[PDB]
Amino acid sequence: EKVFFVTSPIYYVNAAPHIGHVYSTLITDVIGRYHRVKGERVFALTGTDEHGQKVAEAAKQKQVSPYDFTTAVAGEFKKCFEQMDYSIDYFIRTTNEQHKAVVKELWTKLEQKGDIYLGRYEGWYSISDESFLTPQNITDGVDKDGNPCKVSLESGHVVTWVSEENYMFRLSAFRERLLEWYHANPGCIVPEFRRREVIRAVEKGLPDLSVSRARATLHNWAIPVPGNPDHCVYVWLDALTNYLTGSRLRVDESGKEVSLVDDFNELERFPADVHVIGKDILKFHAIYWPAFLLSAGLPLPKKIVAHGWWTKDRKVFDPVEKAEEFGYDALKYFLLRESGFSDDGDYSDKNMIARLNGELADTLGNLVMRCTSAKINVNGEWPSPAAYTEEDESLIQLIKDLPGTADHYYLIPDIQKAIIAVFDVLRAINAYVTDMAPWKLVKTDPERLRTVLYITLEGVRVTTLLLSPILPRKSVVIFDMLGVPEVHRKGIENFEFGAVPPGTRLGPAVEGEVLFSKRST
Numbered sequence: 001e002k003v004f005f006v007t008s009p010i011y012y013v014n015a016a017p018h019i020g021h022v023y024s025t026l027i028t029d030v031i032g033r034y035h036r037v038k039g040e041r042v043f044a045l046t047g048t049d050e051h052g053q054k055v056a057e058a059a060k061q062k063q064v065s066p067y068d069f070t071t072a073v074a075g076e077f078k079k080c081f082e083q084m085d086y087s088i089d090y091f092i093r094t095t096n097e098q099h100k101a102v103v104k105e106l107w108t109k110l111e112q113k114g115d116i117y118l119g120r121y122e123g124w125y126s127i128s129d130e131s132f133l134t135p136q137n138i139t140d141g142v143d144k145d146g147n148p149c150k151v152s153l154e155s156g157h158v159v160t161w162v163s164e165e166n167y168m169f170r171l172s173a174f175r176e177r178l179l180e181w182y183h184a185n186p187g188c189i190v191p192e193f194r195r196r197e198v199i200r201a202v203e204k205g206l207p208d209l210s211v212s213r214a215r216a217t218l219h220n221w222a223i224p225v226p227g228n229p230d231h232c233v234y235v236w237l238d239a240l241t242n243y244l245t246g247s248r249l250r251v252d253e254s255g256k257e258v259s260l261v262d263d264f265n266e267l268e269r270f271p272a273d274v275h276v277i278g279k280d281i282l283k284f285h286a287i288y289w290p291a292f293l294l295s296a297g298l299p300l301p302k303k304i305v306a307h308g309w310w311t312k313d314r315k316v317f318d319p320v321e322k323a324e325e326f327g328y329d330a331l332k333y334f335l336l337r338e339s340g341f342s343d344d345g346d347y348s349d350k351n352m353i354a355r356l357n358g359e360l361a362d363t364l365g366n367l368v369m370r371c372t373s374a375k376i377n378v379n380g381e382w383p384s385p386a387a388y389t390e391e392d393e394s395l396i397q398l399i400k401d402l403p404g405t406a407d408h409y410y411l412i413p414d415i416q417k418a419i420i421a422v423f424d425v426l427r428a429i430n431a432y433v434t435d436m437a438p439w440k441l442v443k444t445d446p447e448r449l450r451t452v453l454y455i456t457l458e459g460v461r462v463t464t465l466l467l468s469p470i471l472p473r474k475s476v477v478i479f480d481m482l483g484v485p486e487v488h489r490k491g492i493e494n495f496e497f498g499a500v501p502p503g504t505r506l507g508p509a510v511e512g513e514v515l516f517s518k519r520s521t
């Protein structure tokens, strides 16, 4: 058994954080959280990509020192992610001195294997993307305010010509082995249609990669190539290596580096089990990264997951201002429920209220109040169930089956599908509780109401446990209301139906207390 290692991308610090950095780190955070509720060892990583030309020129364009500028923005991200109530284990910055150490270690390995040579790169380059492009991937446009230019087909950003003596990685030598890797491990890229993409790109053919830049081009704002101060190491090799760095750093209780281990095995994190990325940075993680790792004889990641968003601004959301107006758990829910891999989601104020009210408030929120109500649940107690009718069983079967299926969805990973799976069982429970009319049974058939109440409660409990990674603060409130002991709030033991025994007492109530309160109509 290993440490389960989940990563977000590390974000260029040229601009403040926005929705999107937050979405990316949310997925990373939710996966991590789910494996922790399974009781696994987890290490989730996130952070900032602070070197290179893009960022240098961002710092120049605001007339501030890049040493001061990267630190400033980096702090804004940290402040944003802290406000966003994630459970990330470490925040990593490429300016960190221990990271620089690993880049040089990694570089030397790449060199010693005979995989790096001194060449030229003469071709197109998007600075905003820090991406080398061939002429098939650029086209005319006017991203220059006035004048007409050539622009990236991927991003749309301005591309410029570069003719440099650069250090070159033999990425071309790694084609057939990448191709083997993708095939032998067909889950290694998710979603499937982006795996299909990568394999087409790599089967067409791979050129060598320009892993360094002339020192003056970058404004000297990059790590020096070992043994050649005239050169700076390509920001993306620098960036990608954060995953290795992070996997080697002992971190103290309050979240600060203390050591850099020599051997990545010592901490047991590497390779990343899941690399959460945005669709715009697929090639770096799915082609370049593996090929680097294969060269140095390092273990390949286990899977790369590219969501449908961009990682870097395109085209109505301040993350924290929205979480403050609508709710932190509801926002995270909404973002996870609404956006799939091919995306096309609707994020209007209408739709957020639609789901807040319909799903969080009327499906989930409502069930909790019925099954803890003073009027229905008269003794504030988990009752022992009597005999089960076939309907009782039918619903119980769903609740028994839910953890297994929700678990597979969580492992794909597909947080959307998982949330759908849980709320399907939730929807069933409401249907069940309508049919059964407990409010009528308190008076007519006390013995029946026991069976029903028990099933509702245990239904609400398990759905809630599988929703914990999405609604972390709100699951805690639900459990307190239900009176679930702390030892039952976590661990696959407690995926089992009937793990909280009858006799358990509910938590105290407040005269007016609400779990999710509807938004205006």
Ligand code: MET
Pocket (backbone or CB within 6 Å): 008, 009, 010, 011, 012, 049, 239, 240, 241, 242, 281, 311, 312
């Ligand atoms: C190590 S992932 C690097 C991602 C890059 N900094 C970006 O913002 O897209």
